[PDB]
């Protein structure tokens, strides 16, 4: 239960480009957390690299703990070069498969890795036990460093620049220059089962993934087990996991291909900007096959098509929570506060004296209920703790400023633009949230993956268009909806879930999109103190960084 990270400049080469990256203990992917249900595990970072950054642990609800959290601005100032932080990791409900990830700029391109997390000492998965467990991770990778790729828009006011491939846990695949060699592969024996726990750890796109061959069983997500079904594809946004069953079927006689191709490739819907459309392959293999049964190319599968919304839709709308005595459900029934949450990308005015290169010549943005978030220099933690002014405003809002038809394709120029603030929603312990989240089609309706720190949340339902507060509910899931901690909302649609704000700290809330993230698709949720011990926020750890 103990781990060292140490942030490392690491060199690495992917098509054919090479370039020193931040790694943790020189692994691109980093290592793999292991625990078990209900597990403390401490882990001790050492910035042994170039730039400031911070370390998160996604989807672990860090009970009254957020100085571990990572969020960087939020939780805390940024771990400097030379400096070192212990975080302390405190698993509740999870289990299943997490993820951790760098939470400071868009150092996640290269520093992330697996967290698992294995049914507790007594306690057996509700599936049989499966044969071997792989994580898959699916990311992306730029010839140029990261940083400079940020830098870059951040000059411009433009779009970020796409990545230069798809990958799966590092390594773009067959398809790719410089890349066959070094192809992901693993190993499979007829008649055994394999769990794939599979992360979209990439920054830019939700992805459709597949397996030739073979059905894949889900059987679990964002570290709470699902209802289980099968079929042939997956969707999965970033910050997501989901883990799902692979039957090794085939043939080792030599009827049948001995080498199958995963394969995955983006979810994305908007012709007018560009994507990194590549796909990414990684190979698996019947070892105990003849070596002509691998003659040829791997079989490959079938993915949707890139724009495929209805095959995106019809993958979502199987997640249901796994409701059963050993695994039970607690859906908040009486709400005490509705928020309806406008998701847009913006624009803001260029600054004088410069052009920028975003719509309009304008620079890009983002926001929440056309609150376009900014980073404080004194992270908004501190600033609770030791109630300092003017770092942010309590005061972000229920509802949209202005309703309009928010899913309207092309709407007018005017209402592209949004203002920049610090502004962050305060809560009582214990009050139960329903968040809806709602698309606008200001610059191009667009599914966004938003996540939720310090909670998971069930996502009771779903539609396209504009949400309606007095017809909506009346078809929400609230027997067996999935409890996630990142939720696809629909393109130019929406997506209302439910919580209990039991967990006192302050708790980032963003589109997982890194770029969105950057332009402000976010806010803050402070959970205050309720009465009791169980109900009070640790206090600050004696090293925290400093502001
Ligand atoms: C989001 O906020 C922006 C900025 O406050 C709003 O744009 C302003 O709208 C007012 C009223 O029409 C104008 O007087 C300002 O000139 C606008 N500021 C600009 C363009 O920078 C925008 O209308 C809001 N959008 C919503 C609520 O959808
Ligand atoms: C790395 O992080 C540190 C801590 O947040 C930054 O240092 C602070 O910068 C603010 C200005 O935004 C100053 O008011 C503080 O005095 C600084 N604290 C220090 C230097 O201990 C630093 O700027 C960050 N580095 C980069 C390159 O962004
Ligand atoms: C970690 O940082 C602290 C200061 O916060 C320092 O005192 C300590 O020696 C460091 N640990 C190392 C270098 O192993
Ligand atoms: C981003 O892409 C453009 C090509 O469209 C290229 O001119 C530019 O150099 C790229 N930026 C970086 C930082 O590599
Ligand atoms: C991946 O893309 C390459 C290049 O377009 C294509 O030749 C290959 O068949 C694709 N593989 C899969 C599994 O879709
Ligand atoms: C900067 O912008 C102002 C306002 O548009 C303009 O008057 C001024 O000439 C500019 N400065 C230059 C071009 O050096
Ligand atoms: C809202 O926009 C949609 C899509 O353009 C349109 O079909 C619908 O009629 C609009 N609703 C209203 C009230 O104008
Ligand atoms: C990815 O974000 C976007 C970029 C642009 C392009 C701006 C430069 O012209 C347009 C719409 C978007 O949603
Ligand atoms: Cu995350
Ligand atoms: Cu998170
Ligand atoms: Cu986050
Ligand atoms: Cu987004």
């Given at each position: 239960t103990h781990y060292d990270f140490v942030i490392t400049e690491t060199k690495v080469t992917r098509l054919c480009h090479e370039k020193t990256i931040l790694a943790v203990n020189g692994q691109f992917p980093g290592p793999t957390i292991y625990a078990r249900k209900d597990d403390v595990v401490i882990v001790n970072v050492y910035n042994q690299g170039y730039k400031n950054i911070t370390l998160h642990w996604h989807g672990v609800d860090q009970p009254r703990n957020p100085w571990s959290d990572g969020p960087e601005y939020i939780t805390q100032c940024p771990i400097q070069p030379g400096a070192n932080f212990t975080y302390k990791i405190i698993f509740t409900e999870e289990e299943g498969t997490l993820w951790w990830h760098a939470h400071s700029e868009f150092d996640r391109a290269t520093v992330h890795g697996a967290i698992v997390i294995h049914p507790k000492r007594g306690t057996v998965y509700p599936y049989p036990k499966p044969h071997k467990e792989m994580p898959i991770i699916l990311g992306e990778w730029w010839n140029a460093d990261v940083e400079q790729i940020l830098l870059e828009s951040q000059r411009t006011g433009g779009d970020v620049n796409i990545s230069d491939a798809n990958t799966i846990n590092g390594q773009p695949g067959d398809f790719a220059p410089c890349s066959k060699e070094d192809t992901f592969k693993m190993s499979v024996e007829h008649g055994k089962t394999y769990l794939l726990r599979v992360i979209?750890?990439?920054?830019?796109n939700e992805m459709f993934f597949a397996v030739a061959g073979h059905r894949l069983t889900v059987v679990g997500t964002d570290g709470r087990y699902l209802r289980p079904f099968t079929v042939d594809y997956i969707l999965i946004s970033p910050g997501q996991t989901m883990n799902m069953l692979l039957e090794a079927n085939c043939a080792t006689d030599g009827s049948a291909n001995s080498r199958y191709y995963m394969a995955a490739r983006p979810f994305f819907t908007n012709t007018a900007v560009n994507v990194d459309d590549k796909n990414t392959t990684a190979i698996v293999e019947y070892t105990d096959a003849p070596p002509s049964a691998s003659a040829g190319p791997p079989d490959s599968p079938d993915l949707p098509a890139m724009d495929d919304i209805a095959a995106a839709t019809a993958y979502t709308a199987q997640l249901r929570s796994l409701v059963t005595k050993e695994h039970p459900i607690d859906v908040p029934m009486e709400v005490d506060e509705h928020m309806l949450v406008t998701i847009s990308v913006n624009t803001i005015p260029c600054e004088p004296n410069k052009t920028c290169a975003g719509p309009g010549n304008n620079r890009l943005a983002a926001s929440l209920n056309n609150v376009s978030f900014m980073n404080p220099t004194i992270d908004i933690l501190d600033a609770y703790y030791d109630s300092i002014?003017?770092?942010?405003?309590?005061d972000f809002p229920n509802k949209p400023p202005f309703f309009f038809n928010?899913?309207?394709?092309?709407?007018?120029?005017?209402?592209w633009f949004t203002k920049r603030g610090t502004k962050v929603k305060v809560v009582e312990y214990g009050t139960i949230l329903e968040v809806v989240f709602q698309d606008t089609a200001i610059l191009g309706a667009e599914s966004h993956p938003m996540h939720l720190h310090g909670f998971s949340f069930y996502v009771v339902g779903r539609g396209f268009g504009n949400f309606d507060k007095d017809k909506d509910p009346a078809t929400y899931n609230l027997v067996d909806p999935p409890y996630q901690?990142?939720?696809?909302?629909?393109t130019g649609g929406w997506a209302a879930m439910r919580f209990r704000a039991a967990n006192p700290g302050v708790w980032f809330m963003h589109c997982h999109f890194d770029r969105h993230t950057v332009w402000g698709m976010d806010t803050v949720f402070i959970v205050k103190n309720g009465k009791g011990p169980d109900a009070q926020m640790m206090p600050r750890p004696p090293n925290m960084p400093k502001c």
């Open positions: 979209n750890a990439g920054l830019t002014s003017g770092v942010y405003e309590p928010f899913t309207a394709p092309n709407p007018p120029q005017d209402l901690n990142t939720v696809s909302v629909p």
